[PDB]
Write a protein that binds this ligand. Structure first.
Ligand SMILES: [Mg+2]
Ligand SMILES: [Mg+2]
Ligand SMILES: [Mn+2]
Length: 280
């Protein structure tokens, strides 16, 4: 059909590729449709679209965003697809979220410093290079200074619940994120549901709350994932009347990560792009 990837990041958030480098890579990997879904920002989207046109690439760019929200005291990520980057409602939410991120980074650095060494905040600010600061920026600092062996080990030792540097979530609500994405003309997507580490009971509660908030879709496919896991999440999407999304969550290349990799949907699920009028 088409090769589609609806979750990726640039250096506007915690990706390591500029939007130009991400787009060049997508073209080389024959991606037909790419969403850029940076964390609590839309700063790359207008320039990315202009770059594609200037380069005469055939890639279809989907305007996106990844919004941190709080639900039942958990950090839940809601992606918006086909948003208007100039939306006033969305821009106001982005400004509030970015102010929260400044305050949160100060507190995370304050706590992480007690378990590591002085200078955490200023050096993580250098890593973020003007982007809104995320846990991934702190994780790189932790790896680069030998407190963890890789980005996967970081979160077993730091930043997460019951580990040094943890700060509880203090974001907008899921319903606020969904309302703002809709006001910007987009579809709201419950991102990476398996990453929340919830029991089936709690995952069903989350999906119910997301539907009740007006949510449109859930990510069913990601690169590191078994067919059975896809089948279970596809069953949930069907049961809860949600469309299915797919995305790599690319931040940088690795043996286990690539644009478009392992992004297929199981039988019966309706894709989030069914009414986008795409072509290969
Ligand atoms: Mg990220
Ligand atoms: Mg996320
Ligand atoms: Mn992401």
């Amino acid at each position: 059909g088409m090769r589609i990837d609806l979750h990726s990041h640039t250096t506007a958030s915690d990706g390591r590729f500029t939007y130009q480098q991400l787009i060049d890579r997508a073209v080389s990997f024959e991606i037909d449709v790419l969403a850029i879904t940076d964390h609590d920002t839309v700063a790359a989207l207008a320039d990315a679209r202009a770059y594609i046109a200037q380069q005469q690439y055939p890639l279809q760019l989907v305007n996106g965003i990844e919004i941190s929200t709080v639900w039942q005291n958990k950090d839940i990520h809601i992606v918006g697809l086909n948003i208007d980057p100039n939306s006033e409602a969305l821009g106001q939410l982005i400004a509030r979220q970015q102010q929260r991120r400044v305050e949160r980074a100060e507190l995370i650095a304050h706590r992480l410093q007690k378990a590591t060494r002085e200078g955490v905040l200023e050096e993580v600010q250098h890593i973020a290079d003007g982007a809104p600061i995320t846990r991934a920026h702190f994780a790189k600092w932790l790896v680069d200074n030998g407190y963890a062996t890789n980005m996967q080990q970081v979160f077993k030792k730091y930043l997460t619940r019951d580990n040094p540097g943890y700060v509880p979530p203090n974001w907008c609500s899921m319903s606020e994120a969904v309302s703002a994405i809709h006001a910007a003309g987009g579809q709201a997507v419950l991102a990476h549901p398996g990453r929340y580490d919830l029991t089936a009971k709690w995952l069903k509660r989350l999906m119910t709350a997301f539907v009740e908030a007006g949510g449109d879709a859930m990510e069913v496919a990601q690169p590191q994932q078994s067919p059975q896991e896809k089948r279970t999440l596809g069953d949930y999407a069907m049961e809860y009347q949600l469309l299915a999304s797919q995305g790599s969550d690319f931040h940088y290349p690795s043996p286990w990560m690539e644009l478009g990799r392992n992004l297929w949907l199981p039988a019966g699920v309706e894709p989030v792009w069914k009414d986008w009028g795409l072509s290969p």
